[PDB]
C-alpha cells in the first residue's frame, strides 16, 4: 500500500509500505581499537586507537531479486493513482 | 584544541580520497599542571582545515562544545507500548 497526505501535492511525502521485507546486510570491516584518555579528574574520553587488519570502506548490501520484485510491486500499486500509460523512473536525491 | 594532523599510513591512490585523518594534539592530564601529547584517528567528515602546515579543528567547535555518549548506555531500540490513562 502507498499512503499519502495527498498525492497531487508535491510537498507532502508519499510513503509506501510493503508486505515482504527486503533483507539488508550492512557492515563496517575496519577493525577498531578503543583507547581511553583521561582528560582530567574522571573524564574518561574515548577515542579510536589503531586500525589493524585492512582498511576498507563500510558498505551496505541488498539482494538483487528481492529488490527487483519489490520495486515491481511498488510500481504496480503506484500506477493506480496516475493512469495506466505512465512511465515511472527513479532517481537519487537532488541536494540538501 | 588545535590539531596537528596527517594521513593514516596507507597506500594512497589519487582517485580515492582518504577517509581517515590521524591527528595528534595537546590535552590536559588528571593533574591540571601537566599535559600530554596524545594521538587519535578521526573521520574526515568531522574535521575542518583552519587557515606546508596543516592544522585542523573539530567541526563543532565554532558552534557549541558538545557531549560524549556514555558507553554504558546502548542505542538499540527497545519496544515501547504506548498506553492510555484512566478516562
Amino acid at each position: 500500500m502507498i499512503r499519502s497526505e495527498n498525492i497531487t501535492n508535491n510537498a507532502k511525502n508519499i510513503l509506501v509500505q510493503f508486505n515482504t521485507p527486503v533483507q539488508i546486510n550492512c557492515t563496517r570491516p575496519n577493525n577498531n581499537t578503543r583507547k581511553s584518555i583521561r582528560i582530567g579528574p574522571g573524564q574518561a574520553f574515548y577515542a579510536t586507537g589503531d586500525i589493524i587488519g585492512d582498511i576498507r570502506q563500510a558498505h551496505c548490501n541488498v539482494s538483487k531479486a528481492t529488490w527487483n520484485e519489490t520495486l515491481g510491486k511498488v510500481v504496480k500499486q503506484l500506477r493506480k493513482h496516475f493512469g495506466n500509460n505512465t512511465i515511472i523512473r527513479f532517481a537519487n536525491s537532488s541536494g540538501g | 584544541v588545535t590539531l596537528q594532523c596527517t594521513n593514516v599510513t596507507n597506500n594512497i591512490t589519487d582517485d580515492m580520497r582518504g577517509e581517515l585523518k590521524n591527528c595528534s594534539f595537546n590535552m590536559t592530564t588528571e593533574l591540571r599542571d601537566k599535559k600530554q601529547k596524545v594521538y587519535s584517528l578521526f573521520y574526515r567528515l568531522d574535521v575542518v582545515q583552519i587557515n606546508s602546515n596543516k592544522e585542523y579543528r573539530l567541526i563543532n567547535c565554532n558552534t557549541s562544545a558538545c557531549t560524549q555518549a556514555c558507553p554504558k548506555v546502548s542505542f538499540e531500540p527497545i519496544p515501547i507500548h504506548y498506553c492510555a490513562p484512566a478516562g
Partner: antibody
Amino acid sequence: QVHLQESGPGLVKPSETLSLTCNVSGTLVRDNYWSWIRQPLGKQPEWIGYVHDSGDTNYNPSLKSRVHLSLDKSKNLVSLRLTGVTAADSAIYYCATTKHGRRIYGVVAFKEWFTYFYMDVWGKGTSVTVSS
Amino acid sequence: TFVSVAPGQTARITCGEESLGSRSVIWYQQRPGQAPSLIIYNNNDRPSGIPDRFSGSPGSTFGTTATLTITSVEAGDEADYYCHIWDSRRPTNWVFGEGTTLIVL
C-alpha cells in the same frame, strides 16, 4: 623453451649513457610483462621495474629520471637505457619475465585490490661496474 | 641472518617488516654465484620446477612476520633467500629485504 641473453659494455666511464638489451627464445614480447633487476655485489638486488606494450610502463620512483625502458617488436628484444652512471650502479644487471595476478582483499568494485608481479626466470647476469 | 642448519632438520627463516595489511610475499631462492630463481609465488602456493616442504607463511593474519618453513634440509638448499613483500597498506617496495643465507653442515 626459454633462455635469455643479456648484453653490456661492462667497463665504462662515469657520467655516461648505459644501454643493455636482452634476447628472446620461443615466445614474444607481446604476451608478457618484462622486468629489469640490478644487484650490487653481495647486497640485496634492486628492481628497476617492468614494461609492456600499450602504456603499462610504470617505473621505479627511486630513479625516475635517468631511465628508459623500451621493447623491440621487430627484433623481439627488450632494452633498458640508463644515463649518468654513478658508482652505486656497479652491479650485475638482469632481464626477466613476469606474470601477474590479483590479490583481492575486500569489495572488488571499490578498487580494494592490487596486483603482484613475480619474476619467474632470470637472465645470465651481466657484471657492469664503472671505473677508469 | 646466516642461519646454519644441519641436514635432516627443520629451518625457519624470517625476513621483512611486520605485517600491516594483507600480505603477498614472494620468496626467492638464490643459487650462490649463479643467477637467482623463484621458489614461492603466492603466500603458500608453489609453482612447478620445485616440490613441496617450502611452506610459506599464511598472510591472512595481522601483526606477523614472514616465516618460510623448510623441513629435511639438504645440501642443495645451501642458497640465499630473498623476501619480497607486497602489502596492502604499504607502498610497493622496489627494494628487497636483507640477504639471509642458509648453511648446511
